[PDB]
Symmetry: C3
Subunit: 243 residues, 3 copies
């Protein structure tokens, strides 16, 4: 890999050198390792979350009683956990030989937290076994631990899949990097009101932008487009998780 | 290229190792070879296909008589073949020295077929010479051969360009990988009804999402944006292929 | 990096070998160097530029008197220069050790010009110090020099950030390559009239598609989504640059 030539940046004006934290350096190295090893594709999709939002908001007091805040992340975690079991190849890693897949029979999912010192991705174990309020409690606990530098490296291991949600900040879509040896990552951006054709007129529906990057060595185009379509369906009516 | 560290995945739960087919392994290797050799950009565009869809549907019985099904692929194949001749740099490969281009004077186009054993990309030769019903017949024949493992490696050689259509499954857009030594690939996702401003009001138009990835060593930004704009124009009125 | 196997392209029909200019070859090499060194993410956003367009058009005669044409580029240059000072990490380069950042205290911005011989990126120095008509005059001068092969390599050095605008040609969005050692590049595509929910109904607003690619070793997801959100805000009301 050819290196970037050094440039005397001070020839063009004043510069200031500030050091990178160790977390930023670990991160830089893992990202660059994933980038070069994984042939990335991003598949974009929009999910209609009008009803899902109404549910979330109508459970505000039950969430309050439980002392948890209920955001879209536990809902995304539950729906993805259901799909990782339905489409097992997303729940796998490429074996070090490059000639077999290791299918994981558990579902643990990490979620990205951007903290001032760098990115951490805490893992929730057995997501397919926890309820929405359990996941909400857990996600908040791990996020606060991540911010407080109090998270154990123990809790950043064993993920099958990652969710990276920027919806609280903005954006229409992005192309996340797969956290190798995982095979896929779901980016979530900001939901907005969009006109959706019902067959006769455009209705306003609250649409959530989804961006799935995947390792194309393990997942082909039709599989990935089937995963985001199924995820948009489950999010459009999450009672389907019950059958 | 730093390798991904091996992880004992069984520390986190139960695992199952399943082998990769040879096709999946050939594919993994070509994809990773393209990924590292081609600096990729994807240019997105939406084509108004309202009239083109009306045409397709009104020729359903002539297609039936010919025993072919007429989908959007032959139409995409014809329009791309016309543009590969109009903008010759898309119809070329970089010479092994990296200092000349080999401009191809023929137009053969491959199209991706995802089969249970892996991805195959059959090639149709001299697309610019065949009619819409010839291409429809041919594309279906090659697709069935690809599924039946009966396709000759003969028929997976010599493409100038590739079309990867996921529209039958879903999605809004994706970022396909260039099938090197080709210089560009057209991803096609699902068409949907969108409000398009006519100058005074939004009309419902059926819009087809197009995603062109190209090798930026050979094609610059303005060339690629000109190719997708011209493709959206031809698809908005394909009678322009006649002049 | 595995090489692409040579193919006898003439087995499939007639070929023509044409040479690459030196500029195309320099470019191919820098692009491929950036591609392999920078783990790229693209963050997409749409900015409401209805009022900004009305301003641009209402100043047509003052621009004329100044002999400059006022396009959206000087406006983009000023708004980005304001944000590079507000969010200093975008105005930096990774030190050759990979363990510190060099924060630049100046703001020079390059912009891509696609000329028949290849891509050039002229640099405007101290963008944060020039007015909209100064930048308009300068951008046009440098663009004409770039086309006339008369631009000095002097004038292609020292950029902190690059803007690549394809809006004059077309497209909905694209994924530009970071011009390393820079850490981010803003792609701009074609503005179009879109229905935007005001809380009660969809109004037609002129929306500008923005595509920010960044080096994820230096910039994380939340920072990049905050940069495009803030840029969409400044473009929605550029009087905010005054406070
Ligand atoms: O398998 S994808 O390349 O359609
Ligand atoms: O040639 S592109 O980088 O505008
Ligand atoms: O820092 S990004 O991966 O959310």
């Amino acid at each position: 890999i050819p290196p970037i030539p050094p440039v005397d940046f001070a020839k063009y004006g004043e510069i200031e050198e500030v050091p990178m934290t160790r977390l930023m350096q670990i991160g830089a190295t893992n990202l660059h390792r994933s980038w070069l090893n994984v042939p990335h594709v991003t598949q974009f999709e929009s999910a209609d979350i009008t009803e899902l939002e109404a549910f979330r908001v109508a459970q505000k007091a039950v969430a309050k009683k439980a002392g948890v805040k209920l955001t879209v992340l536990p809902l995304l975690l539950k729906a993805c956990a259901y799909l990782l079991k339905e489409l097992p190849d997303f729940n796998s890693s490429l074996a070090p030989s490059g000639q077999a897949l290791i299918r994981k029979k558990y579902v643990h999912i990490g979620f990205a937290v951007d903290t001032p010192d760098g990115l951490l991705v805490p893992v929730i174990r057995n997501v397919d076994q926890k309820s929405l309020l359990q996941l909400a409690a857990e996600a908040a606990e791990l996020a606060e631990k991540a911010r407080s530098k109090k998270l154990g490296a123990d809790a950043m291991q064993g993920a099958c899949f990652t969710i990276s949600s920027l919806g609280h900040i903005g954006g229409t879509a992005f192309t996340p990097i797969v956290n190798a040896p995982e095979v896929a990552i779901l980016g979530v951006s900001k939901a907005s009101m969009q006109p959706v054709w019902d067959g006769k007129a455009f209705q306003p529906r609250l649409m959530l932008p989804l961006s799935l990057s995947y390792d194309h060595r393990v997942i082909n185009g039709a599989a990935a487009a089937r995963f985001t379509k199924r995820l948009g369906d489950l999010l459009a009516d999450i009672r389907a998780i019950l059958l």
